[PDB]
C-alpha cells in the first residue's frame, strides 16, 4: 500500500521552517515568501508542496499535534499496570511541552481565532486523549460511562493544568519532580500527599 | 464603622435586573435604558446608583464572583478534617454553578474580551481560590511552596473541569453523584476508583 512509501524529506524540512515562521510572526504576518527564503527552496517548489498558506499552517499544526498524541497513545500501550502507564503518559506530555516549544505554543496558546478550523483541530486532538483515557477507565474500573468520562476529563485537565503551571512558572522544580508530583497526585489524590 | 451599615436594598434589586440584561444581550447590546425599564426605576435613579454601564457590569460580575468565592472560603472554614472540607468546598462550587446560572456564564464563559479588566477580575478571583487551597496544602503537608502550588492548581483545575463537563453534558448524573465522584477522585486518585 502507498501509505507505507518513504516520507517526503523535503516536506518535513519545509514544515520545520514554516513552524519557525508561524510561531515567530503569527499566522497573519507570516508569509510564503519568508518561508521559501528560510527553507532555501524556490517559492514555486514551496507551492508545489503546499498550494496555500492555510494548508501549510494546518499541516504544521497537525505535525505538532501528532507528535503529542502519538506519544501519549504509545505511553498507554507500554503496560497495563496503571500506576506505571500513568507515569509514562504524564512523562510523554511533559517531554513534549519541554522539547517541542513551538508545538506547545501552537496547541495550548493558540491565538488564530479568525479560523474556526484551527480551534477545532485542537479540540478534536484533545478529545482523542480524553477518549483514550476514558476507554481505559471504563475497561479497568466499575464506573459506568458518565462517571468514567467525568474522571477522564478531570485527569487530563488536572495533568494539563499542572504542566502549564510548571512551564508558565519558568520550571521552578525539575521536570522529573513536576512529572512525579503530578503522577503521585493523579494516583493517590490528596490522601497520599506527604505529611 | 460605616461598612457595617445596612445594604442598599435598591442596589441589590438593580444588580439582579442588570445581570438578566447583560446575560441575555451581551455587554455591547445591553443598555441602561432596558435595565431602567425592567427595574421599574427611572433612568436618573439608575444613574444615581451607577454612573456608567461599565461600572454596573463590573458590579454585576463582582456580586457573582463574591457569591462563589465566599461560598468556597466558608466551606474551607467549616472543618480541618480535609476529606470533609474537600466535599463541603466542591459541593459549594457545584451548588453555585447550578443555582447561579448567570454567574456561571459570566465567570466561566465570559466573551467580553474588549475590556481587559473583566478577564483580570476573573483571574484575580480564581487566584483567590487557588491561594486558599495552596495555604491549606502548605500548612497540612510536607510539600514545599513550589510543589504545594502545583497541586493546588491541579486540584482547583480538576474540580472546575469535572463540573464544567457535568454542566456542559446537561447533567447526565445527579449533582450529588457529580460532587461525590469529583471529591472521591480528588481525595483517593485513580488508585481508589471502584474496581
Ligand atoms: Cl510525507
Ligand atoms: Cl517557541
Ligand atoms: Cl450596599
Ligand atoms: Cl443563565
Numbering used by the authors:
A (entry chain A), B (entry chain A): 31 to 225
Could you pull the original sentences from the published paper?
We had previously identified the transcription factor FasR, as a key activator of fas and acpS gene expression. fas and acpS, respectively, coding for FAS I synthase and 4-phosphopantetheinyl transferase (essential to produce functional ACP), form a single operon in Mtb. FasR:DNA binding is regulated by long-chain acyl-CoAs, which are themselves products of FAS I, namely acyl-CoAs ≥ C16 disrupt the interaction of Mtb FasR with its cognate DNA6. FasR is a TFR member that senses long and very long acyl-CoA moieties, subsequently turning off FAS I-mediated fatty acid biosynthesis. We have now determined the 3D structures of FasR from Mtb, in three different states obtained with the protein (i) crystallised alone, (ii) co-crystallised in complex with the fatty acid C20-acyl-CoA and (iii) in complex with a double-stranded DNA oligonucleotide bearing the specific FasR-binding sequence.
FasRΔ33 readily crystallised in the absence of added ligands and also in complex with acyl C20-CoA (arachinoyl- or arachidoyl-CoA). The FasRΔ33-C20-CoA dimer is strictly symmetric, with the crystallographic twofold axis relating one protomer to the other. A striking feature of FasRΔ33-C20-CoA is a tunnel-like cavity, delimited by helices α4, α5, α7 and α8, with its two openings towards the bottom and the top of the EBD. The tunnel is ~28 Å long, with a predominance of hydrophobic residues on its wall pointing their side chains towards the lumen of the tunnel. Electron density becomes less clear towards the tip of the pantoic group, likely due to high mobility of the CoA portion, eventually vanishing in the region corresponding to the 3′-phosphoadenosine diphosphate group, which were thus not included in the final model. In FasRΔ33-C20-CoA, the dimer is opened up, with both protomers separating away from each other, compared with FasRΔ33-C14. Using the position of conserved Tyr77 Cα as a reference (at the centre of helix α3, key to mediate DNA-binding), the two HTH domains in FasRΔ33-C14 are ~48 Å apart, vs ~57 Å in FasRΔ33-C20-CoA. Taking the above observations together, we hypothesize that binding of a ligand, long enough to fill up the entire hydrophobic tunnel, stabilises the FasR dimer in a more rigid configuration, fixing an open HTH geometry that is incompatible to bind DNA. The latter magnitude is enough for the C20 chain to fully occupy the tunnel, its distal tip located immediately beside the bottom opening that leads to the space between protomers in the dimer.
